Design an enzyme around this catalytic site. Structure first.
Site, PDB file in Angstrom:
ATOM      1  N   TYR B 510     -15.934 -17.398  21.405  1.00 14.67           N
ATOM      2  CA  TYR B 510     -17.287 -16.574  21.722  1.00 14.67           C
ATOM      3  C   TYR B 510     -16.829 -15.473  22.592  1.00 14.67           C
ATOM      4  O   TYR B 510     -16.559 -14.390  22.216  1.00 14.67           O
ATOM      5  CB  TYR B 510     -18.605 -17.192  22.075  1.00 14.67           C
ATOM      6  CG  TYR B 510     -19.729 -16.174  22.169  1.00 14.67           C
ATOM      7  CD1 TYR B 510     -20.250 -15.812  23.344  1.00 14.67           C
ATOM      8  CD2 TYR B 510     -20.150 -16.022  20.882  1.00 14.67           C
ATOM      9  CE1 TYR B 510     -21.155 -14.657  23.325  1.00 14.67           C
ATOM     10  CE2 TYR B 510     -21.180 -14.990  20.785  1.00 14.67           C
ATOM     11  CZ  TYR B 510     -21.708 -14.493  22.043  1.00 14.67           C
ATOM     12  OH  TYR B 510     -22.946 -13.562  21.929  1.00 14.67           O
ATOM     13  N   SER B 593     -20.233 -13.458  15.475  1.00 12.41           N
ATOM     14  CA  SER B 593     -20.912 -12.364  16.217  1.00 12.41           C
ATOM     15  C   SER B 593     -19.950 -11.825  17.578  1.00 12.41           C
ATOM     16  O   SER B 593     -18.899 -11.262  17.098  1.00 12.41           O
ATOM     17  CB  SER B 593     -22.027 -13.190  16.984  1.00 12.41           C
ATOM     18  OG  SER B 593     -22.927 -12.473  17.541  1.00 12.41           O
ATOM     19  N   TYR B 594     -20.298 -12.134  18.806  1.00 13.23           N
ATOM     20  CA  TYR B 594     -19.224 -11.474  19.817  1.00 13.23           C
ATOM     21  C   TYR B 594     -17.799 -11.986  19.767  1.00 13.23           C
ATOM     22  O   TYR B 594     -17.114 -11.447  19.623  1.00 13.23           O
ATOM     23  CB  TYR B 594     -19.775 -11.496  21.192  1.00 13.23           C
ATOM     24  CG  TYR B 594     -18.941 -10.959  22.526  1.00 13.23           C
ATOM     25  CD1 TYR B 594     -17.683 -11.142  22.426  1.00 13.23           C
ATOM     26  CD2 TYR B 594     -19.627  -9.844  22.824  1.00 13.23           C
ATOM     27  CE1 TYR B 594     -16.992 -10.321  23.599  1.00 13.23           C
ATOM     28  CE2 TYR B 594     -18.911  -9.022  23.708  1.00 13.23           C
ATOM     29  CZ  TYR B 594     -17.632  -9.473  23.912  1.00 13.23           C
ATOM     30  OH  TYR B 594     -16.638  -8.413  24.865  1.00 13.23           O
ATOM     31  N   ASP B 671     -28.250  -8.445   7.915  1.00 13.10           N
ATOM     32  CA  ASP B 671     -28.136  -8.753   9.356  1.00 13.10           C
ATOM     33  C   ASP B 671     -28.758  -7.300  10.125  1.00 13.10           C
ATOM     34  O   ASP B 671     -28.026  -6.226   9.982  1.00 13.10           O
ATOM     35  CB  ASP B 671     -26.405  -8.611   9.616  1.00 13.10           C
ATOM     36  CG  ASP B 671     -26.386  -9.350  11.118  1.00 13.10           C
ATOM     37  OD1 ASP B 671     -27.206  -9.071  12.107  1.00 13.10           O
ATOM     38  OD2 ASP B 671     -25.298 -10.087  11.178  1.00 13.10           O
ATOM     39  N   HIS B 703     -28.257 -12.409  10.641  1.00 11.37           N
ATOM     40  CA  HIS B 703     -27.040 -12.883  11.851  1.00 11.37           C
ATOM     41  C   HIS B 703     -26.757 -14.211  11.804  1.00 11.37           C
ATOM     42  O   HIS B 703     -25.616 -14.544  12.080  1.00 11.37           O
ATOM     43  CB  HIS B 703     -27.326 -12.133  13.109  1.00 11.37           C
ATOM     44  CG  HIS B 703     -26.157 -12.047  14.103  1.00 11.37           C
ATOM     45  ND1 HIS B 703     -25.068 -11.208  13.672  1.00 11.37           N
ATOM     46  CD2 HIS B 703     -25.884 -12.547  15.367  1.00 11.37           C
ATOM     47  CE1 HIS B 703     -24.110 -11.342  14.708  1.00 11.37           C
ATOM     48  NE2 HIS B 703     -24.675 -12.109  15.649  1.00 11.37           N
TER      49      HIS B 703
END
Ligand SMILES: O=C([C@@H]1C[C@H](N2CCN(c3cc(C(F)(F)F)nc4ccccc34)CC2)CN1)N1CCSC1
Ligand SMILES: O=C([C@@H]1C[C@H](N2CCN(c3cc(C(F)(F)F)nc4ccccc34)CC2)CN1)N1CCSC1
Ligand SMILES: *[C@@H]1O[C@H](CO)[C@@H](O[C@@H]2O[C@H](CO)[C@@H](O)[C@H](O)[C@H]2NC(C)=O)[C@H](O)[C@H]1NC(C)=O
Ligand SMILES: *[C@@H]1O[C@H](CO)[C@@H](O[C@@H]2O[C@H](CO)[C@@H](O)[C@H](O)[C@H]2NC(C)=O)[C@H](O)[C@H]1NC(C)=O
Ligand SMILES: *[C@@H]1O[C@H](CO)[C@@H](O[C@@H]2O[C@H](CO)[C@@H](O)[C@H](O)[C@H]2NC(C)=O)[C@H](O)[C@H]1NC(C)=O
Ligand SMILES: *[C@@H]1O[C@H](CO)[C@@H](O[C@@H]2O[C@H](CO)[C@@H](O)[C@H](O)[C@H]2NC(C)=O)[C@H](O)[C@H]1NC(C)=O
Ligand SMILES: *[C@@H]1O[C@H](CO)[C@@H](O[C@@H]2O[C@H](CO)[C@@H](O)[C@H](O)[C@H]2NC(C)=O)[C@H](O)[C@H]1NC(C)=O
Ligand SMILES: *[C@@H]1O[C@H](CO)[C@@H](O)[C@H](O)[C@H]1NC(C)=O
Ligand SMILES: *[C@@H]1O[C@H](CO)[C@@H](O)[C@H](O)[C@H]1NC(C)=O
Ligand SMILES: *[C@@H]1O[C@H](CO)[C@@H](O)[C@H](O)[C@H]1NC(C)=O
Ligand SMILES: *[C@@H]1O[C@H](CO)[C@@H](O)[C@H](O)[C@H]1NC(C)=O
Ligand SMILES: *[C@@H]1O[C@H](CO)[C@@H](O)[C@H](O)[C@H]1NC(C)=O
Ligand SMILES: *[C@@H]1O[C@H](CO)[C@@H](O)[C@H](O)[C@H]1NC(C)=O
Ligand SMILES: *[C@@H]1O[C@H](CO)[C@@H](O)[C@H](O)[C@H]1NC(C)=O
Lengths: 729, 729
Positions: B510, B593-594, B671, B703
């Site tokens: 992450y 995501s990140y 998203d 998302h």
């Protein structure tokens, strides 16, 4: 054999380049041709040339010139730059006019930026152009424009240009204006898209764009509200005499006004006679009006005694639309390709005020197009020669004696050349023949007076040399018999093809109505590499629904898209297995566009025949595709018409069956034609039943996925997929 | 070993479920617990229960009930149904209220359909709800509601609810309503998004939808126009049927009004005292106002002497936002977690009218949260124990003597339990401890007076029994040293782990600011299956930018996203690849995501360490992501501020470097958070440099890609990809 093969990089990088000979006739005697960026003028009779425009004249112009066009009188040249593509035919550009006499650019009263279409009059140097959806006319290149329409409105009213569906499906062109033969009148159509729903999709643009734009296009899907149309004629000679010249409307016949309809053809017959064809939204009834200028009233009258009806009981009208009329000089008669009593398309000869026409050709083959008409002869292209529907030759019929038919191209080089198109000079004094296969393209010039070959224009001998040192594949063109009917197929066969061995087969599919994928055309393409380098046989088959073989075959899919044309592809692959040189564990299928639909339908059939396949930009459900194309074959998606078959012929309904195959699904995100939606719905349906598959989107690519980078990328991705599918582990 | 492994289907079908014990405290003595659809009430001291609501009482209701909310006085129950999800926290629903004493549904003056938010007052049974972006109050569940605001306008003015960015990034809630402790007053915020640009994207919907719809959400990307905010307090005791309610505005301090700002915290201190924190758009300066009700004037006054400034020299304020104050009973002082002089987050004690606070805790570890406050003790969670950043325990500190800190959970079961959260009863008389690892979750109940362990609520005994029949992976939590700094990692290790064998390794990333991926939590997830069935080591690493270890580490990526957190992942993998039990030819990386951003940045680094990787819904360019989150770390993308680093930190610029890796890129088309745009630009950059890759879009997924079918499909497709990447010749 130790020669190199034709590899993927050869295809992607254009190593072996087909030479063309694109000429533009400027008169009955001369044509323009581009040599080392110079535009030369050639004398047809002797073959000598001069420099028409030196490659240096516009060095200091300040922009790249995309294209040019000379005014018919040779006095001016129109220069097109700042080309920005829109849809398939439409684009916008900037224009300058260059005076060839004063050898100077015109700097006054310039054609504006963001002009949508421009055309010279057919004689002299008048111009008509469309800008912000309105028509303008310039009598002289340097003088002010006359505005013709004031109703133009972005995405709503289109004067002199087509909307999306008319461009794509009806006219195959952006322009919707038609000068009369000597340029007195300008006829034009006006399209009204007020109640047409919009397709909306994202366009991401350069990475510098922070928020994506939403592209919004009036696009009627099957059964939605269509654009409406009106037709006008303006007298451009009156423009300098009157403040605001009147556009005289010519209304559609009563038989069209009762419901939704289309304007589908506009053809001038004489200086004061125009013909228009209209098509009902149910595309099996069309009406031609023939309208004369009434000099006393200033109006256009269409005598009902001159109205011609064209209808079809077994299908739609025309191949993709009603055929164009070709008028004799006096405008009192015309020739038209129409379907005869046996369902074969042949030339019919009409008197403008008699309803019954006389067929001047006949037989179990079809006329493809009428190419020129003189007082003595009509020239046409057909697939008559050797009963090969995938061949094309030029013929000449004597108008005073229909029994006198000469094939002008058949015997010129029968081994090398079985597929011809033609380009006639202005009054048909000369013709260029374009041979496109089965051998290398060959371009030749001929004189009509005696049908003598004048010279070879381009024979592709440089390429022929290069290809000698390459293990090229061969092409087999033949037929198989199903239910007493011949169905044609072609195979791209690996070099050193051995019937005793078992090869993997890729079925290359289009199979839309009136399509033809079995022919005599020479091609350097992805299949060339697959056969040459990967030892894959690439096959294509023309089954029910295919064209140029009569209506029995073509109309077999009427109201029933996604049936016989799909089944016949599966049957073809079975027949190819029987032929004994095919590895039955390694049969694949692929197609783009209509071919993506068929590929998907085949992969979802449960047939067990295909290991894997690739659909690029497929239709998935007929209610998602445009009205004009879809309804032509499918009628309307309503309980009372054909809804049940619309609902029965989707890819999504076969989702469970994809458990049995390897599928690759590919689509451009900015496809304005087959909307990304179509593939979005396939993927969701496969997700919903738990089918694994491969996928690729192409950001900002349209239906052609044709940008240089995306083109190379998609074929590279597909190659990996096919190689993996066929690999022996 | 003949036991089954933990398979992909096990993960996907939830074969092995953790048992929970979710309770809701209703007083200092009792809690509610949902048991087989019946709602029981438990006495904390004895553990006896009664039924509060039978599972059959609503058998005839006519709708499936999404959720229940019992009024604080136990007299009414709110019934939630027709739940329609919006963003991460937001949704609309329908409500009915059931009178628990009349034993009947209320049919008069019902809460309307499509209600956006509803909340009981904290005491009694008043209701405030938002419908069509305006606030309404009901004093009694059967009485007419009073309208509080009239300016509600879809996508434009939001009263008592958050817009997209405030929901996602500021409040982590759709609610923008705050009742005073006894319900006299209702405070609320009003958001104005007039000039906030809209993200637009297609939603395809069910197959039956002929034209895709375009979703349009006011969403400020980095540097764009933000929503503005106002704050109000209304007296709910003095509402009239006859005249419109008067809302009193509390305006932000001058130091905020000088530029763009946010409201970031609202916390009631007493019945007549409210505190607010505001944050500058440049998020290193925040201010707390403390405001008192003036009975004489009916106005709210925030004395300047009661203003508290909080700023940061090394980064932004707070972990993700300024921390919340915890007021004492009289509201004259409060405790607040703030970064001390060493950059470690600890509890500071403030007097409402004094500038200096006193740190009551200290050390090279951090307080995670303040959990309960009484006159004698503050109760908090920290990672102090054994110096382990990824462990959590409950402590109490004696307010009269800060040297007296007692760990309440540390020694309960040190082998099984190193990560706790807590839930206290109304006056902290009881607490529930929730141990979540490294062993199976364990729920226990305790009394505060002598910290007695009253009873085991749920010990996951059943799951323990089942899991012993399965070849479960283990977990190693340890550290490596970089520049004399300790950085923590975890490895999910295959069953029968052999240090002499060489395993492939997947780096699970992450790595967002204040993230923590190395901890003592027990999880059953995709990694469990990869280790147990596929014999893959799944590692995660917490490098520069990670949380709970002080600001030196956390603020190391200030103004520099996509640098040290990316490098540190490469460095950790480099180090792992030099361990004896890791196959350096088979190291992969993945993140969502990140983590997808970081995975892409890593794969584009040219490090040569990673064979392959998967990015799911990655950020690709910080200018595409939302203002509040992005600018917190990056400032503004202007040449005067931080544009150069915005431009240097994109995935797209690294495209060339992907030539030596296998990459799988995945993204949901709907998203609303990390827009599909971000992946669309990655794919286009890879196409443009001729890099081949794998891709998958998920039609209509957001998302979370969390629909049952899409979740199974994504994990299936990724598993195929990893397996293929790790397969040996
Ligand atoms: O894009 C489309 C459709 C196809 C449709 N095409 C079909 C082929 N078509 C035509 C092809 C050819 C050929 F070949 F003889 F030269 N000649 C034509 C001569 C006159 C008019 C049309 C012609 C031109 C128009 C336009 N939109 N899709 C339809 C279903 S899947 C996606
Ligand atoms: O979706 C996003 C961002 C992340 C952002 N998150 C970050 C994590 N975050 C938080 C996580 C946690 C934890 F850890 F303690 F539970 N506690 C929080 C306590 C108070 C406020 C926020 C917290 C909640 C908000 C919301 N949108 N992206 C950021 C870049 S890529 C996509
Ligand atoms: C040229 O004539 C046309 C046709 O009358 C004029 O267009 C009309 O203008 C009026 C008032 O602006 C509108 O209400 C009509 O609907 C228009 N009709 C059409 C067919 O467009 C146009 O304005 C005239 N141009 C000039 C310069 O006078
Ligand atoms: C082009 O054709 C038009 C249409 O016939 C010609 O215009 C007519 O010319 C004759 C003169 O012989 C007149 O009787 C009519 O008044 C004209 N009609 C109209 C509608 O203008 C025109 O002269 C021809 N142009 C050229 C250059 O030959
Ligand atoms: C929400 O904010 C907008 C500004 O973004 C306010 O609209 C402005 O109001 C002023 C004063 O009435 C006008 O002079 C401006 O023209 C408006 N600006 C714009 C850009 O429209 C709006 O009033 C605010 N709404 C509420 C309810 O506070
Ligand atoms: C909740 O607290 C409020 C605010 O202190 C109480 O309202 C005040 O009560 C006092 C004492 O009777 C009155 O004299 C004040 O005039 C009230 N102030 C306001 C602003 O209303 C309220 O009564 C309390 N409610 C409950 C249920 O205890
Ligand atoms: C909040 O962060 C900004 C941005 O880093 C700081 O502004 C910088 O401050 C000094 C001058 O005092 C210079 O390094 C730069 O010119 C400023 N940068 C920008 C982009 O303006 C600001 O000082 C910080 N605030 C606090 C209280 O630390
Ligand atoms: C070609 O040749 C003839 C001379 O025989 C000449 O009159 C003609 O102008 C020439 N044409 C060109 C284009 O050079
Ligand atoms: C221009 O024309 C001449 C041939 O006459 C040729 O040498 C040159 O390559 C052409 N193109 C240029 C100068 O760009
Ligand atoms: C286009 O059609 C609409 C009817 O939907 C009509 O209101 C409008 O006036 C038309 N505009 C024209 C013909 O210019
Ligand atoms: C045109 O098509 C419809 C539907 O097939 C049909 O009802 C109508 O009779 C057709 N017209 C002709 C001439 O066959
Ligand atoms: C539990 O038992 C006590 C008596 O020992 C009783 O007063 C109380 O109401 C009970 N609580 C519940 C929730 O059943
Ligand atoms: C909510 O919707 C239902 C069904 O349309 C309707 O009958 C009901 O009265 C609505 N409820 C309210 C409170 O308006
Ligand atoms: C309250 O205010 C709104 C608009 O601001 C108005 O429409 C309404 O009539 C008012 N009601 C009363 C009772 O004053």
């Amino acid at each position: 054999d130790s020669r190199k093969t034709y590899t993927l990089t050869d295809y992607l990088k254009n190593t072996y380049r087909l030479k063309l000979y694109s000429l533009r006739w400027i008169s009955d005697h001369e044509y323009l041709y581009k040599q080392e960026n110079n535009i030369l003028v050639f004398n047809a009779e002797y073959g000598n040339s001069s420099v028409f425009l030196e490659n240096s004249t516009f060095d200091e112009f300040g922009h790249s010139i995309n294209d040019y066009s000379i005014s018919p009188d040779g006095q001016f040249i129109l220069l097109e730059y700042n080309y920005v593509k829109q849809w398939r035919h439409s684009y916008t550009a900037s224009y300058d006019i260059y005076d060839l006499n004063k050898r100077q650019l015109i700097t006054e009263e310039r054609i504006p930026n963001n002009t949508q279409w421009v055309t010279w009059s057919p004689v002299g140097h008048k111009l008509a152009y469309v800008w912000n959806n309105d028509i303008y006319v310039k009598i002289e290149p340097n003088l002010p424009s006359y505005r013709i329409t004031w109703t133009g409105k972005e995405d709503i009213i289109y004067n002199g240009i087509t909307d999306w569906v008319y461009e794509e499906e009806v006219f195959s062109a952006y322009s919707a204006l038609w000068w009369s033969p000597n340029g007195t009148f300008l006829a034009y159509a006006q399209f009204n898209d007020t109640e047409v729903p919009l397709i909306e999709y994202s366009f991401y643009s350069d990475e510098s764009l922070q928020y994506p734009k939403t592209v919004r296009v009036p696009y009627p899907k099957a059964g939605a509200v269509n654009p409406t149309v009106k037709f006008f004629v303006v007298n451009t000679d009156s423009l300098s005499s009157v403040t605001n010249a009147t556009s005289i409307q010519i209304t559609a016949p009563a038989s069209m006004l009762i419901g939704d309809h289309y304007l589908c053809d506009v053809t001038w017959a004489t200086q004061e006679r125009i013909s228009l064809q209209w098509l009902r939204r149910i595309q099996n009834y069309s009406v031609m009006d023939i309208c004369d200028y009434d000099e006393s009233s200033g109006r256009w009258n269409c005598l009902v005694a001159r109205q011609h009806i064209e209808m079809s009981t077994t299908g739609w009208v025309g191949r993709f639309r009603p055929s164009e009329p070709h008028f004799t000089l006096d405008g009192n008669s015309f020739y038209k390709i129409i379907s005869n009593e046996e369902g074969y398309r042949h030339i019919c000869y009409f008197q403008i005020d008699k309803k019954d026409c006389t067929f001047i050709t006949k037989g179990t083959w079809e006329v493809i197009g009428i190419e020129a008409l003189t007082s003595d002869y009509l020239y046409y292209i057909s697939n008559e020669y050797k009963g090969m529907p995938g061949g094309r030759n030029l013929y000449k019929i004597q108008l005073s004696d229909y029994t006198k038919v000469t094939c002008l191209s058949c015997e010129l080089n029968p081994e090398r050349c079985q597929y011809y198109s033609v380009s006639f000079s202005k009054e048909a004094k000369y013709y260029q023949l374009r041979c496109s296969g089965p051998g290398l393209p060959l371009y030749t010039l001929h004189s009509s007076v005696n049908d003598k070959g004048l010279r070879v224009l381009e024979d592709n001998s440089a390429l022929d040399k290069m290809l000698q040192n390459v293990q090229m594949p061969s092409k087999k063109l033949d037929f198989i018999i199903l239910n007493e009917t011949k169905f044609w197929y072609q195979m791209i066969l690996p070099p050193h093809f051995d019937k005793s061995k078992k090869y993997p087969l890729l079925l290359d599919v289009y199979a839309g109505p009136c399509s033809q994928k079995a022919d005599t055309v020479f091609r350097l393409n992805w299949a060339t590499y697959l056969a040459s380098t990967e030892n894959i046989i690439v096959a294509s088959f023309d089954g029910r629904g295919s064209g140029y073989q009569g209506d029995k075959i073509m109309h077999a899919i009427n109201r029933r898209l996604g049936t016989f044309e799909v089944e016949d592809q599966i049957e073809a692959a079975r027949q190819f297995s029987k032929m004994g040189f095919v590895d039955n564990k390694r049969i694949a299928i692929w197609g783009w566009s209509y071919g993506g639909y068929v590929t998907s339908m085949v992969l979802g059939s449960g047939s067990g025949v295909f290991k894997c396949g690739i659909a690029v930009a497929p239709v998935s459900r007929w209610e998602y595709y445009d009205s004009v194309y879809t309804e032509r074959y499918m009628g309307l998606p309503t309980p009372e018409d054909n809804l049940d078959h619309y609902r029965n012929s989707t890819v999504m309904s076969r989702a469970e069956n994809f458990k049995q195959v390897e599928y690759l699904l590919i689509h451009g995100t900015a496809d304005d034609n087959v909307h990304f939606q179509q593939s979005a719905q396939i993927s969701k349906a496969l997700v919903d039943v738990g089918v694994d598959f491969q996928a690729m989107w192409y950001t900002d690519e349209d239906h052609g996925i044709a940008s240089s980078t995306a083109h190379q990328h998609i074929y590279t991705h597909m190659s990996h997929f096919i190689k993996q599918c066929f690999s022996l582990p």
